[PDB]
Each structure stands twice: as C-alpha cells, then as structure tokens.
C-alpha cells in the first residue's frame, strides 16, 4: 500500500532485525550439523611427503601424498590408508 | 564471473565402524590445473571508473 503525505525519520545501523538474522542462522547452522556423523579418532600422528607431478604443473604447490593408521570396524584391528591433504590442512610438530 | 575446478579427482569411502561411513580423498587422474576465475576486463575497468567518480 502506497502512503500519502507522510514523512518519517530513518536510521540503519541500529535496526534490531539484523541481529535476529544473525542469531538464527547460527542456531540453524549447528542444528543442521549436529545429529549427523561425529569423528574424534582421526587426528593421529602422520608422516607425509608431496605428490610426484605436483612439480609438473602450473600449480607447483602442495598436495602431500600421505598415510596413517586408523581404527577399523573391529576394535582389535588397524588398517593402512593412503590419501591427500593440502598444505592449509596440515602442519608439523617441532627422521621423517 | 566464471569459476571452475579442473581436476575431477575420484573418491573412495571406508568404514570407521560401527556405522560411520567416512569419506576421504582418492586419486588424481589427468593433468593438474589449480583453481581460478575469469572476469571481463573492460567492464571491470568501466565500473571502477564509475565508482571513483
């Protein structure tokens, strides 16, 4: 509905509904994320070196052909894996 | 803007157990090109000249 012969002061930066958009998305994000699968036992120590044609590309950066031990289905069995992780996902501790 | 990821890099999945199907990164097949974005040059000049006025 268009209005007629009416003025009004207006001020942003003090509106309350920006925080109500702020608060519910936080409560929406974790609630969508919580009841799916958890993983604690992954962050175990690991040795790691780069991938071979990483040096053969425009991207001469970091790929890290990598491996570790992980608990299996049964509690008394372990297994060997092989995977990749970027430099921005891994850091060393301060021999391989 | 157009933004792509070239290497389609197929995946694998193992089981943590009981009932935790973990997904992890598999292996590269093909060349390697890092991610990038193209942008129209002269239009970016035009709007930057527009905003500075």
């Amino acid at each position: 509905i268009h209005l007629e012969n009416v003025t009004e002061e207006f001020n942003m930066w003090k509106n309350n509904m920006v925080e109500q958009m702020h608060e519910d998305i936080i409560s929406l994000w974790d609630q969508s994320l919580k009841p799916c699968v958890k993983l604690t036992p992954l962050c175990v120590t690991l040795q790691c070196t780069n991938y071979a044609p990483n040096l053969l590309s425009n991207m001469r950066g970091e790929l890290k052909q990598c491996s570790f031990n992980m608990t299996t289905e049964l509690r008394d069995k372990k297994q060997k894996v092989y995977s990749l992780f970027y430099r921005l996902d891994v850091v060393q501790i301060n021999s391989n | 803007i157009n933004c792509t990821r070239p290497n389609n890099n197929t995946v694998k999945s193992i089981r943590i157990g009981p009932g935790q199907a973990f997904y992890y990164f598999g292996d590269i097949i093909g060349d390697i090109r890092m991610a990038h974005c193209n942008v129209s040059k002269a239009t970016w000049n035009e709007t930057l000249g527009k905003v500075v006025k």
Epitope: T49, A52, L55 | -
Partner: antibody, heavy 121, light 111 residues
C-alpha cells in the same frame, strides 16, 4: 616391466630432419610421465624431460631451444620426437624412461633401451 | 647451473666401507627437501635406481646399504660389499627447474 622398443638411424649432416620414435609397454600409458636421456662419453649425458597428458612443458632444458619438439599420443600408446637443425657436440638420442609415483622430486624407475647413432660425416 | 662434487674414481679393498659425497651443487633446499636419488650403471647394463625418495632402501634390491642426508651436505655409506657392487654411481639431487648431475664414480675392488 616391459621395456621400450626404439629406432634410431641418426647419420645426417647437420639438417635435423630426423624422426625418432618410442614404443608402448604392458603397463598403462596414461597417468604418468616420461623423459629422455642421451649418451655422451662420460659427461652426465642429457636432461630432457616431458609431460603427462597435456602437461605444461615442451622444452625441458635450455640450449635445445627451437630444436626439441616432443609430442605424445595417447591413442596408440606411443610417443616420438623430432630434433630439427642438429648441432655438433651431439651423438644421438638414447634412452626412454618413466617418472612414476610415490617418489619425491622425480625418478627414472624404468629404462627402455639405448640407441647409438653417430650423426656426422 | 650447479657445482657437483665427487672425490675421484674410487677403489675398495673389500673392507665394507666406501663413502663418497656430493656436498652442494647449489644453495640449500626447503622443508620438503626434495633431493633425488642415486643411479647406478655398468658398461653391460642401462642405468638403474639404488635408493628412492631421498631416504630409504628400494623394494627390489636386498637390504645391505643406505645413505645419509641432511639439508644440503651429505654422503653415502655401504655395508659388507661383494662382486657386483663395484660400479659407477651418479649423484642427481636437484629438482626445481632443471634436472642436473655432474658427479659420478668409478669404483673397483683392489686386487
């Protein structure tokens, strides 16, 4: 595991109209990379590397400029090269090799065959 | 451009120890130290890997020798030697823009 059949009859005064071809093997031809090493008498012998499928090199070293022209064919699983306008201080092209994975920098984990063909006079 | 190192054409009196070195072809190397491996050949054979991935012994050869590596300057070692060990050992390490080696050995048992 399978070595690489080669073919070289390089006996031409300095015009490098001289094709040399590689072969295939029992392993897969894609998803890897190859290189080329020649043979000089006791002076460390060549460094010419090549690419993977559609990779971003055509010349690996300096001092081969305008003369290198490596190609690759995924279809018949066999590559070849052409060394135009041949200079002196040059015996022939000799070896083929494979880069492989699970190394760090680069390595030549297999070696096809060396071919000797003196070019001049 | 590099500046590789080897003492000479070597010899051995079958005494289990033979250490040859290539200290600094160029400047230092980074955390992924990337120094590649040593190859061998004899005049009746094409070249062949000894060591892989800068540290550890190859699957395919028996467990009887290794080598040391630290940053830039290092060497090899060996452990009891025999007939087919006396050979020519080349030293390529550098992997960034060129691939290089200038070093090399000529090793033979002493009569």
């Amino acid at each position: 595991e399978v070595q690489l059949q080669e073919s070289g009859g390089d006996l031409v005064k300095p015009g490098g109209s001289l094709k040399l071809s590689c072969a295939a093997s029992g392993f897969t031809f894609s998803r890897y990379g190859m290189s080329w090493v020649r043979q000089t008498p006791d002076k460390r012998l060549e460094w010419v590397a090549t690419i993977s499928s559609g990779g971003s090199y055509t010349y690996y070293p300096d001092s081969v400029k305008g003369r290198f022209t490596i190609s690759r064919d995924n279809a018949k699983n066999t590559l070849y090269l052409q060394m135009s306008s041949l200079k002196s201080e040059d015996t022939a092209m000799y070896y083929c090799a494979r880069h492989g994975i699970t190394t760090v920098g680069v390595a030549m984990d297999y070696w096809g065959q060396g071919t000797y063909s003196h070019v001049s006079s | 451009i590099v500046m590789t190192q080897s003492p000479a054409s070597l010899a051995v009196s079958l005494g289990q120890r033979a250490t040859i070195s290539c200290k600094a072809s160029q400047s230092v190397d980074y955390d992924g130290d990337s120094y590649m491996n040593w190859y061998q050949q004899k005049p009746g054979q094409p070249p062949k890997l000894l060591i892989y991935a800068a540290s550890n012994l190859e699957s395919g050869i028996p467990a009887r020798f290794s080598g040391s590596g630290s940053g830039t300057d290092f060497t090899l070692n060996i452990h009891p030697v025999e007939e087919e060990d006396a050979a020519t050992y080349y030293c390529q390490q550098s992997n960034e823009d060129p691939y290089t080696f200038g070093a090399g050995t000529k090793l033979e048992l002493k009569r």
